[PDB]
């Protein structure tokens, strides 16, 4: 028995999670961990000749791209259908959330008055002119944040928010979240928007002592209510080992599997907040109930309006 996993989680291997599954079930896990867009392009080109059984992808936008490319087949699993929150899975049962991340506000309290920052709407405050820094629009994480705003506010109000936000940017757009954390830590930026787990990795020494010292200087603000995004898995449309792929997906979505995956990347498990002491110090959050499917629905529109307002 074997199952082949093509995984977009390539921050640092889930080998340990796959080995636990192998040890428990006798099912050999053969995995590839690489960039999610590379996996999607490879599978579109391979079609029926692909060896993928299970596909794991990061961010609502990439899940939407794989869905549009018909990469997944619908599955029936009483375990997944009764265990994965409705808002974090496909209504059509093609993909299922595994871990949760939050895109949050980071601030340098020496450069900005953090008492005036509670939510994304506060970043349009004119007192922050020249103090806001952003990763570029190519980031699915940012596309999904703008999609989240469209879902909840509609295009008109989201465009007003975007114009206010981009008005406060006077720094070239960043090519990653960790570089933006460094700039906020150093104080060249007063405010950024990054995923919560990058702050936790730097605080925990993962990127070396300079990055840890810079991350210690930041104040992380979880918007209330919070924008939640996910990593998800689904069974490949032509999976040879369909039965084994479902068993592995059931394991990954379970309390043991979701904790195993989340603890490797400093993410939150599916049904509980992280017990990691660094992550728990960031505080409690309340989801805004926008579904992951809705984040995909508005992805194209989010890219359009980001381009229109000069989020470059
Ligand atoms: Fe990431």
Same domain (yes/no): 213, 292: yes
Q: Are residues 186 and 281 in the same domain?
A: yes
Q: Which residues are annotated as part of the binding site for Fe(3+)? A: 11, 141, 197-198
Coil, strand or helix: which one is 19?
helix
Count Cβ atoms within 10 A of the Cβ of residue 77 and give its class: 0-12 exposed, 13-18 middle, 19 or more buried: middle
Q: Are both 199 and 266 inside the same structural domain? A: no
Extract the tokens encoding 30. 């053969």
| Ligand 1 centroid from CA 152, angstroms | 24
Residues 249 and 260 both lie in one domain: yes
**Positions at the binding site:** 10-11, 141, 197-198
Residues 173, 136 contacting (CB under 8 angstroms): yes
Same domain, 22 and 139: no
| Technique that determined the structure | X-ray
Indicate if 161 and 283 belong to the same structural domain.
Answer: yes
- Which DSSP state fits 278? H
72 and 26 in a common domain = yes
Output Rg (C-alpha) for the chain, integer angstroms. Answer: 19
Distance CA 171, CA 251 (A): 44
Instruction: Say whether both 309 and 208 belong to one domain.
Output: yes
Structural domains in the chain (count) = 2
Distance 203 CA to ligand 1 centre (A): 16
Cα distance between residue 3 and residue 144, in whole Å = 31
Query: Which stretches of 60-121 are DSSP H helices?
Result: 60-68, 78-83
Alpha-helical runs (H) found in the chain = 15-25, 36-46, 60-68, 78-83, 140-167, 177-186, 196-203, 209-215, 242-253, 255-265, 277-281, 292-297, 299-309
Segments forming the whole domain that contains residue 201: 102-229+277-312
Q: Indicate the SS3 state at residue 27.
A: coil
**Exposed/middle/buried for 148, CB within 10 Å: 0-12, 13-18, 19+?**
buried
Distance CA 26, CA 2 (A): 9
**Rounded CA separation 24/118 (Å):** 45
Reference 31, options 42, 19, 46; nearest CA is 19
Binding residues for Fe(2+): 11, 141, 197-198
């Amino acid at each position: 028995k074997e199952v082949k996993v093509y995984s977009g989680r390539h921050y640092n291997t889930d080998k340990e999670v796959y080995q636990k599954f192998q040890e428990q079930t006798g099912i050999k896990v053969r995995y590839i961990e690489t960039d999610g867009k590379a996996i999607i392009e490879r599978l579109k080109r391979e079609g029926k000749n692909s060896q993928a059984d299970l596909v794991i992808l990061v961010d609502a936008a990439i899940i939407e791209n794989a869905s549009k490319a018909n990469l997944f087949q619908k599955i029936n699993s009483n375990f997944l259908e009764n265990s994965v929150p409705n808002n974090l899975r496909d209504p059509r049962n093609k993909w299922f959330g595994l871990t949760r991340r939050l895109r949050v506000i980071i601030s340098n309290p020496d450069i900005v008055d953090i008492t005036k920052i509670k939510n994304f709407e506060d970043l349009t405050n004119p007192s922050f002119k020249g103090k806001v820094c952003l990763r570029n629009r190519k980031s699915p994480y940012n596309q999904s944040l703008v999609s989240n705003q469209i879902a909840k506010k509609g295009v008109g109000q989201t465009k007003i928010w975007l114009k206010g936000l981009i008005s406060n940017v006077s720094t070239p757009y960043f090519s990653g979240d960790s570089s933006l954390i460094r700039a906020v830590g150093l104080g060249t930026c007063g405010i950024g928007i990054v995923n919560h787990y990058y702050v936790a990795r730097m605080l925990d020494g993962v990127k070396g002592p300079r990055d840890a010292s810079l991350a210690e200087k930041i104040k992380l603000i979880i918007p209330n209510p919070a924008h939640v995004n996910i990593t998800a898995g689904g069974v490949y449309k032509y999976a040879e080992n369909k039965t084994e792929a479902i068993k592995l997906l059931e394991y990954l979505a379970s309390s043991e599997g979701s904790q195993g995956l989340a603890n490797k990347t400093y993410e939150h498990p599916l049904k509980e907040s992280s017990q990691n002491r660094i992550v728990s110090k960031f505080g409690d959050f309340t989801p805004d109930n926008v579904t992951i499917k809705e984040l995909g629905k508005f992805n194209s529109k989010a890219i359009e309006i980001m381009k229109e307002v000069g989020w470059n």
